[PDB]
């Protein structure tokens, strides 16, 4: 019997994985343009982008499952944290603040 | 005639003792209880009443020809000791004792406690 | 709060509950 390489690729790929893993893989790829270097996963630009992507993916999730209150509370906490991070960047580092707003298509409403 | 093997079922539930004689297929041949012997509401709880009922059942069992029996006990009580001893001393051979007391895995809600 | 304090409040609460039930089915509430 011959070896089936096409089967190995499918198993190692994202096809046979839960939905959450597949979504998270796409989130990392979407921040390849604003990251500082090939391995940056903690800069303020990357962190804010990942939080924004998570919110967008969660909107359809809770339209069907309207009773999972635990997940909503976690989302609400992250929602407020992101606002305070952007408030700090604007006051101290405007050029970084401008890039994040432009990339994610937000509005300049993060003053004090 | 006398080469008959039977089963004796003893039920004791803290208020009365019921003894039933059956064959090996489950068909009943005789049964006795303290009230059938002469012991009534308050006197049915005495060890003497259990012994008398056990003796009467043994007499009927011997008449029918059941000499070898197996005893199945259901419940926890003190009357079982006296009934079993009386059967052995009455001339009936006992080959096995089996306890089949049930145990719920959860089950139904019991009644409230008595505030006496 | 102590047991004595609970008992002192208990009597007054009972009286208020009794009066409200009496007025539950009256045209003109007694007050």
């Amino acid at each position: 019997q011959n070896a089936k390489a096409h089967l190995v690729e499918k198993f190692l790929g994202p096809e046979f994985r839960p939905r959450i893993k597949q979504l998270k893989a796409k989130r990392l790829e979407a921040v390849n343009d604003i990251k500082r270097h090939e391995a940056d996963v903690s800069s303020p630009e990357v962190r804010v982008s990942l939080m924004t992507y998570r919110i967008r993916d969660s909107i359809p999730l809770f339209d069907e499952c309207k009773k999972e209150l635990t997940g909503m509370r976690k989302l609400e906490i992250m929602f407020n944290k992101r606002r305070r991070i952007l408030r700090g960047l604007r006051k101290h580092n405007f050029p970084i603040y401008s890039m994040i707003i432009n990339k994610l298509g937000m509005r300049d409403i993060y003053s004090d | 005639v006398l080469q008959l093997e039977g089963v004796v079922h003893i039920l004791n539930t803290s208020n009365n003792i019921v003894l039933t004689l059956t064959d090996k297929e489950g068909r009943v041949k005789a049964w006795t209880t303290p009230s059938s012997v002469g012991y009534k509401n308050a006197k049915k709880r005495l060890p003497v009443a259990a012994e008398t009922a056990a003796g009467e059942l043994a007499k009927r069992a011997l008449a029918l020809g059941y000499s070898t029996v197996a005893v199945k006990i259901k419940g926890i009580g003190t009357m079982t000791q006296y009934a079993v001893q009386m059967l052995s001393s009455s001339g009936i051979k006992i080959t096995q004792l089996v306890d089949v007391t049930p145990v719920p895995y959860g089950g139904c809600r019991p009644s409230r406690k008595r505030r006496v | 709060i102590t047991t004595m304090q609970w008992r002192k409040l208990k009597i007054k609460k009972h009286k208020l509950r009794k009066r409200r039930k009496a007025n539950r089915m009256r045209v003109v509430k007694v007050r």
Binding site: - | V98, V103, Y105 | -
Partner: protein, 90 residues
């Protein structure tokens, strides 16, 4: 002195299908023994309990000793003898 399996053996064979292996952690009446008697770690205690419960759901185990299934011990030994003979011949 009684046989005791190694923790490496438990982690490799703790499955609901291995009824024979799981029997070492059951009392003679068929109940689950506490951890203070099995001498197992907490993660291993949980696995053994779940394997037994799953086996009961699949009718591979009984929640307690049953009077109508007392001939199984004879059956298992008869099956074991045939299997050993077949493999030995092969």
């Amino acid at each position: 002195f009684r046989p005791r399996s190694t923790h490496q053996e438990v982690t490799e064979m703790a499955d609901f299908k291995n009824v024979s292996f799981l029997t070492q952690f059951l009392s003679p009446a068929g109940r689950i023994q506490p951890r203070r008697v099995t001498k197992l770690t907490e993660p291993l205690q949980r696995r053994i309990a779940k394997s037994v419960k799953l086996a009961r759901n699949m009718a591979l185990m009984a929640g307690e000793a049953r009077l109508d299934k007392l001939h199984l011990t004879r059956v298992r030994q008869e099956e074991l003898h045939r299997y050993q003979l077949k493999k030995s011949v092969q």
